[PDB]
Amino acid sequence: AKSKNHTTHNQSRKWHRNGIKKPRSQRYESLKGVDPKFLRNMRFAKKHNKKGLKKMQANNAKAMAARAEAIKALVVSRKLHRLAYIAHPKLGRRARARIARGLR
Amino acid sequence: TNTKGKRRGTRYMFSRPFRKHGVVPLATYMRIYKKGDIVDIKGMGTVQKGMPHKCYHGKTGRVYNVTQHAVGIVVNKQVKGKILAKRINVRIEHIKHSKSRDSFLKRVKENDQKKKEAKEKGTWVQLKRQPAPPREAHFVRTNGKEPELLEPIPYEFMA
Amino acid sequence: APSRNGMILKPHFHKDWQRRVATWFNQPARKIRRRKARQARARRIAPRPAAGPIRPIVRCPTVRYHTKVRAGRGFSLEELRVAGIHKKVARTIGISVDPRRRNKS
Amino acid sequence: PSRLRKTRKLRGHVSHGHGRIGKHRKHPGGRGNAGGMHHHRINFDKYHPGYFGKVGMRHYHLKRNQSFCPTVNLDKLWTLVSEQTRVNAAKNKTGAAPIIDVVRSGYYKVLGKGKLPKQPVIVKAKFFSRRAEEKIKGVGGACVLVA
Amino acid sequence: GVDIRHNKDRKVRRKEPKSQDIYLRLLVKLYRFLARRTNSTFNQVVLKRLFMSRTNRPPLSLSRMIRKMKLPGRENKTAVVVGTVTDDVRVQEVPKLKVCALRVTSRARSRILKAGGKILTFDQLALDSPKGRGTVLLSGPRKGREVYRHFGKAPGTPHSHTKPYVRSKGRKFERARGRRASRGYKN
RNA sequence: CCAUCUAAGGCUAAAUACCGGCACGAGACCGAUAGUCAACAAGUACCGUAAGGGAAAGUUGAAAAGAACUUUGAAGAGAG
RNA sequence: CGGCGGCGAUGUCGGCUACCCACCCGACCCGUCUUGAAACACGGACCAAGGAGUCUAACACGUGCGCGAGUCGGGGGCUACGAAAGCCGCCGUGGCGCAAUGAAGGUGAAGGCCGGCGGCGCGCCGCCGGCCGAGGUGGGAUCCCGAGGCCUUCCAGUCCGCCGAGGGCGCACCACCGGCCCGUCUCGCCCGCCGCGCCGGGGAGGUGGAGCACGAGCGCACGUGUUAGGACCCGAA
RNA sequence: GUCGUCCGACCUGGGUAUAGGGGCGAAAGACUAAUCGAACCAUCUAGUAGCUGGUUCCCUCCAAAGUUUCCCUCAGGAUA
RNA sequence: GCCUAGUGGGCCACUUUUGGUAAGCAGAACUGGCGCUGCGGGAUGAACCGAACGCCGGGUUAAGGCGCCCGAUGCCGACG
RNA sequence: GCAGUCGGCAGAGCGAGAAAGAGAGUGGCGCGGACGCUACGCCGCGACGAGUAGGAGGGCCGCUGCGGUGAGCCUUGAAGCCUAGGGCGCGGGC
RNA sequence: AGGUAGCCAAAUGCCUCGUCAUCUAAUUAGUGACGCGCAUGAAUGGAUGAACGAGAUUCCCACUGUCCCUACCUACUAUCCAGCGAAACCACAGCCAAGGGAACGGGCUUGGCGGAAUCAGCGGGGAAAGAAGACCCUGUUGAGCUUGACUCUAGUCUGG
RNA sequence: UGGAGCAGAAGGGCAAAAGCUCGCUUGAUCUUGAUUUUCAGUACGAAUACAGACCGUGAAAGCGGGGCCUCACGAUCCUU
RNA sequence: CCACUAAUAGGGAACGUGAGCUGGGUUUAGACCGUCGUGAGACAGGUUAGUUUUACCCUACUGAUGAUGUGUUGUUGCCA
Ligand SMILES: [Mg+2]
Ligand SMILES: [Mg+2]
Ligand SMILES: [Mg+2]
Ligand SMILES: [Mg+2]
Ligand SMILES: [Mg+2]
Ligand SMILES: [Mg+2]
Ligand SMILES: [Mg+2]
Ligand SMILES: [Mg+2]
Ligand SMILES: [Mg+2]
Ligand SMILES: [Mg+2]
Ligand SMILES: [Mg+2]
Ligand SMILES: [Mg+2]
Ligand SMILES: [Mg+2]
Ligand SMILES: [Mg+2]
Ligand SMILES: [Mg+2]
Ligand SMILES: [Mg+2]
Ligand SMILES: [Mg+2]
Ligand SMILES: [Mg+2]
Ligand SMILES: [Mg+2]
Ligand SMILES: [Mg+2]
Ligand SMILES: [Mg+2]
Ligand SMILES: [Mg+2]
Ligand SMILES: [Mg+2]
Ligand SMILES: [Mg+2]
Ligand SMILES: [Mg+2]
Ligand SMILES: [Mg+2]
Ligand SMILES: [Mg+2]
Ligand SMILES: [Mg+2]
Ligand SMILES: [Mg+2]
Ligand SMILES: [Mg+2]
Ligand SMILES: [Mg+2]
Ligand SMILES: [Mg+2]
Ligand SMILES: [Mg+2]
Ligand SMILES: [Mg+2]
Ligand SMILES: [Mg+2]
Ligand SMILES: [Mg+2]
Ligand SMILES: [Mg+2]
Ligand SMILES: [Mg+2]
Ligand SMILES: [Mg+2]
Ligand SMILES: [Mg+2]
Ligand SMILES: [Mg+2]
Ligand SMILES: [Mg+2]
Ligand SMILES: [Mg+2]
Ligand SMILES: [Mg+2]
Ligand SMILES: [Mg+2]
Ligand SMILES: [Mg+2]
Ligand SMILES: [Mg+2]
Ligand SMILES: [Mg+2]
Ligand SMILES: [Mg+2]
Ligand SMILES: [Mg+2]
Ligand SMILES: [Mg+2]
Ligand SMILES: [Mg+2]
Ligand SMILES: [Mg+2]
Ligand SMILES: [Mg+2]
Ligand SMILES: [Mg+2]
Ligand SMILES: [Mg+2]
Ligand SMILES: [Mg+2]
Ligand SMILES: [Mg+2]
Ligand SMILES: [Mg+2]
Ligand SMILES: [Mg+2]
Ligand SMILES: [Mg+2]
Ligand SMILES: [Mg+2]
Ligand SMILES: [Mg+2]
Ligand SMILES: [Mg+2]
Ligand SMILES: [Mg+2]
Ligand SMILES: [Mg+2]
Ligand SMILES: [Mg+2]
Ligand SMILES: [Mg+2]
Ligand SMILES: [Mg+2]
């Protein structure tokens, strides 16, 4: 009783019924497999980013003034265009009313 | 059935090109691979260490980890009906920088360079690249000469 | 055969359990009969209390329960001796007696 | 209710929801947990890792009342006493701190999980966690061992 | 003959509550009218949340509701949940809360009402704010049930922190072969 | 060291069990191919040397008022 | 249609269907196993009656109800239908839940700021006090504020409602980063006392865990699925 | 019908003895109540079956697989 | 995201293709079919061509056809 | 989409290409008006409809028995059964 | 140990219808020999051999319907009638040729064609009936028997 | 230009080498995790980049945690 | 192979034809020999003994009555 050994016959149909989805790339991907020395130092950097917090607020409030002051320191046819202006509901309102104000 | 060997059927794939054997040229080793950089995988057979498997040869991926002599790359690999994002470790000899993204970088530099100027001049530039349009109506000058008359050749049995 | 994610179960039904199945359809009948036996006892011992003799205060052993006190089997012979009650007249005037129980405190 | 069962809608269909090719046979695969190491090994390893094998010491006559130690965290520590116990202790000025015996309420050990409200307390337990006692000292208070 | 697939034509979203509760159905009858005849999307989210099962309406504890109304900019404003407001006993101080809910547990009612707060029901919420202005819609943890610890990657695959189904837990219950390096392998 | 009993002799109700038996009561049960094998001359008739096996079979009508008398036929069976 | 016609009481009108018959076209006998049945595959002469996914237990998930950090009297007890229902709380014993981890001994779930003092050589490496205090980033249903504006002769001029550039707080949830707990490993300096010990406690960095990180469970009912039971029904040698 | 034997290891009635992994056998695995390469009866027992057969109302909506890997696996399961 | 039935005997054809003298043979790749599916056409027909189906009226087509069976040339059809 | 059946307590609008108010104040005779709406209902648009194994939904389809209900039916005739009668429903069936 | 005495194409010889003789018109048969004996052989008994045999073969005489080559007669049937009166079997049924088709049709396609109800015969067909193929294979189904199979055990030997 | 050798089958790879000859050695050591390969995206085996030790070697850059790569191997229970 | 003869051609029809026969040979159970096997047993190796069932159904076939029509009947006929 021999039988069929191997095929990949209906498989490309079955893979495409629910689709061959690309894997879900979202930002901030995981850090598994990165170099442990680099990751240990990165965790030390993240552990001490709060240390220079005063320099951040000092330079942030200083950069706010030096740019917020710097912003205000120196500061197709005569038929079809005209009909598109008259038949515009908000632009051609008084000019549309002028037709009746002549038509009386 | 076949064998599940790691280099099965890689006789021409991992072989060196003709008259390209021997010493690896040393600017292969001098290229800077950052995190997130897009590179192409191509297994050099001179170096037997760090060799990618044959299913990664000719695939393009994103570098997620850098070590002394090798990088980790996220590679799309289709496994029947699902595509997995591979975390592979492969040496510097078996990779090369992909040029597919550095023309998009050329396009974004000439697109922000065409947004930031001509805005003060008021005109409108184009940034989305249109496909190859139908050919414009043009005149064809036959100055003097009449178009040469072609006939099919008689069949002669060549050999 | 097992299906996907589920518990591994070991039902103890490999014996002939259906001969020895004890249904409880006589539960309210047992309750009603126990009740009538209780009132028959209470009517028989007419001024003596219905639950029975007085039971002593015992500390439960075995650390889960050793903060809790409960009713023991009987007052011990040294408790009756210090109370000045004969250990044979105690059960006649309604005192439970436990000869087996020591005191340690 | 037999009338809401699937077997009422299966009246008139030949194979009763079990297929014409592979039928409803008796026990195709063995009974119970048969073949858990042989032919159901993939299921047993994929969903029940650690089912086979023998780990750790035996203890022949285990009395579960011996290792009885119900624990309480410090966030539920004031739930053992009434509310007037907390608010009278809050309003008084003599420093008269109430006692919480957790053995009285039914616990043997105090672990310290939550934050503890800022007022003194005397806590009696059979055992204490280190973080529990240091939080009671930090809020101001005492840990009293009882047996 | 048209080449279209009909596998996902029928949406598998609830049109009505499966509950035959007449009080919930009168609430749904109110908020069908509100979610249809108003421009407010709050009323739509309220009506679709009134549809859901009990598991998709997990209870909201007092402390979670305290901290979600504690955020800056959410003062004098009504907490709305379409589930249960339950008591949380690890809470020492309860500030003034204006709450609308389907059910409030009895001790949570005592704590909120002794705190000087108001408990509304949804028919009162509709008469107070017909479009849900001045509302903070909240939910309980929808993964808070213990089924989700069993849900995920199969335990027995690498880096799979999924709780297995055990009859009991102990040293001889699912701890040996696939879980120690000494007993064959570790995942 | 400590703890706990005092073996190799004996009796003892109650709570507990009860598909046999005596007498009952009940039922979201079954309704004569069902329900016990057995609604009835049922562990009967019948079978096997034996151990054993083992049925079928309820219903006129309210009341037998169960058709006197006449006639054909030897009668069964008819017609009145 | 604000257009008309004809036929009518014992021989005619209508009745798609319903009984029989006629004709044209179509049309092989069902069930089953099978790649393939009208098969020279098997079962079926005909009719009536009977005749096959049930019940119990466990688990999983979903859904409904009640109560909810609890929940549950199922066992016991008190007071015709009713062997029911009601009650008990100093009957919650107990189960499951609120805590995990380790083989076990066992242990067991945030911290920062300020005042005082190259001891060392916690400027670094503990304790006295006070204060603030349960993380962050991105997305995120809802919701909040509002530069302006939604005409009826025209300027104001107020209130209400609506819309809105833009900016916010951000539910649940997801992804990532930190943080905390138990096992284990590596490094390293201290802190404690009734007994200063082969004592006890702490830190930094990884790593194993079915964890924590402001609960979600319990009981009941329904439905499916997997089992143990005669186990959908009939069948061995 | 034709045949073997028909004074002897002959034929035959009744009584008696041996009983089921046992008897008895001038031996064919023959006979042991039409049953024998292990009788018959009842029970365990509704023994188990990856194997055949069957599996009972209507309408509506959706709609496959015979492929991967592992298995004393190849007429079967687990897994995707 | 959960739960999950059925399936895990396949077969046929263009093109590629291995063994075999070859096979309505055995074995693969790609895609489409048949199985699971009626309909028009190939006289007939699992798979070929056209085309996929709620119950109907009008119209029109595809692939096939148009002496008669048998709808359609019963055209004063073209050139051999 | 429809709770807007908003009626001498009246004024009968909201299909219209273009974000929003048929807003309100103050200075400069005859007694009338279809239907609807078991909101688990009713109405309107558009696209679609093959199906084995299998899954799900709706059954004013059917049987038996129980709990409620129909001031139900029934010896002036119940169940059952027969019928070239009348019909209904896509059908189960009535 | 290397098969001795004997015997043989035997009931034992593949090649093989062995070679020679004899038997016949003609003999793969029979008998007598021959022995290189696939693979004869001595109480796993060898060789012989009267008498006996419902034992297996070959030839001859005699006799005959065994046959050439069939025919006729008799009894009981069959047949018909009176009385009596079953069973097997049965999807529906029943005329063919070719086609296609699960590769041998009663039905389908295309043709040939087709006429009530019946009797005696008949054995071509119904892949006729009879009995879930006994041959073959599969089953993680058995049973009878054997032993150098695995694991035991009655008995028995031996020691304490 | 490798037409030699690199332990072997074959293929790939290799020339101041990966071959041959010396010198010194024991990275063929201890310990976490991640990954590839077969894959169900499970184990084993094999492999790959890291990291933490402690070493070898070289003037040093470096290189080494077995063999130039593709093969050379083994769960639970038990024993040691 | 003998003999005759004009010649002593080859085939098919489920390798036509067993409810037509026969049963010599294959191919059950009895038994002998050779070879093989420790053995039970095996042998496209010899040898001997070994139950051949049913038609009355439908068709086909062969005969036998008849059947529709000419009004009924009979005689004589014709030949598709
Ligand atoms: Mg197969
Ligand atoms: Mg299954
Ligand atoms: Mg009592
Ligand atoms: Mg179906
Ligand atoms: Mg079936
Ligand atoms: Mg099913
Ligand atoms: Mg199956
Ligand atoms: Mg089953
Ligand atoms: Mg195995
Ligand atoms: Mg369509
Ligand atoms: Mg469909
Ligand atoms: Mg779908
Ligand atoms: Mg004594
Ligand atoms: Mg005694
Ligand atoms: Mg009867
Ligand atoms: Mg009856
Ligand atoms: Mg009976
Ligand atoms: Mg009768
Ligand atoms: Mg026709
Ligand atoms: Mg079948
Ligand atoms: Mg077949
Ligand atoms: Mg069929
Ligand atoms: Mg055929
Ligand atoms: Mg069959
Ligand atoms: Mg039959
Ligand atoms: Mg019936
Ligand atoms: Mg639930
Ligand atoms: Mg009663
Ligand atoms: Mg399940
Ligand atoms: Mg059964
Ligand atoms: Mg079952
Ligand atoms: Mg049986
Ligand atoms: Mg004898
Ligand atoms: Mg024999
Ligand atoms: Mg099988
Ligand atoms: Mg089969
Ligand atoms: Mg199968
Ligand atoms: Mg083939
Ligand atoms: Mg084949
Ligand atoms: Mg099939
Ligand atoms: Mg399809
Ligand atoms: Mg089709
Ligand atoms: Mg043709
Ligand atoms: Mg084509
Ligand atoms: Mg038409
Ligand atoms: Mg035609
Ligand atoms: Mg359909
Ligand atoms: Mg000799
Ligand atoms: Mg002769
Ligand atoms: Mg001779
Ligand atoms: Mg011999
Ligand atoms: Mg011999
Ligand atoms: Mg007669
Ligand atoms: Mg036939
Ligand atoms: Mg016909
Ligand atoms: Mg015949
Ligand atoms: Mg068979
Ligand atoms: Mg058989
Ligand atoms: Mg098998
Ligand atoms: Mg056996
Ligand atoms: Mg290292
Ligand atoms: Mg080397
Ligand atoms: Mg084992
Ligand atoms: Mg023949
Ligand atoms: Mg024949
Ligand atoms: Mg015969
Ligand atoms: Mg013979
Ligand atoms: Mg024989
Ligand atoms: Mg006859």
mmCIF file with all atom_site columns, C-alpha atoms (C1' of nucleotides) in Angstrom, chain F residues 46-49 52-53:
data_model
loop_
_atom_site.group_PDB
_atom_site.id
_atom_site.type_symbol
_atom_site.label_atom_id
_atom_site.label_alt_id
_atom_site.label_comp_id
_atom_site.label_asym_id
_atom_site.label_entity_id
_atom_site.label_seq_id
_atom_site.pdbx_PDB_ins_code
_atom_site.Cartn_x
_atom_site.Cartn_y
_atom_site.Cartn_z
_atom_site.occupancy
_atom_site.B_iso_or_equiv
_atom_site.pdbx_formal_charge
_atom_site.auth_seq_id
_atom_site.auth_comp_id
_atom_site.auth_asym_id
_atom_site.auth_atom_id
_atom_site.pdbx_PDB_model_num
ATOM 1 C "C1'" . C F 1 46 ? -43.084 -25.201 25.696 1.00 0.00 ? 46 C F "C1'" 1
ATOM 2 C "C1'" . C F 1 47 ? -37.502 -26.938 24.964 1.00 0.00 ? 47 C F "C1'" 1
ATOM 3 C "C1'" . G F 1 48 ? -33.071 -29.517 26.716 1.00 0.00 ? 48 G F "C1'" 1
ATOM 4 C "C1'" . U F 1 49 ? -30.636 -36.076 29.681 1.00 0.00 ? 49 U F "C1'" 1
ATOM 5 C "C1'" . G F 1 52 ? -30.497 -24.429 32.638 1.00 0.00 ? 52 G F "C1'" 1
ATOM 6 C "C1'" . G F 1 53 ? -33.524 -21.666 28.877 1.00 0.00 ? 53 G F "C1'" 1
#
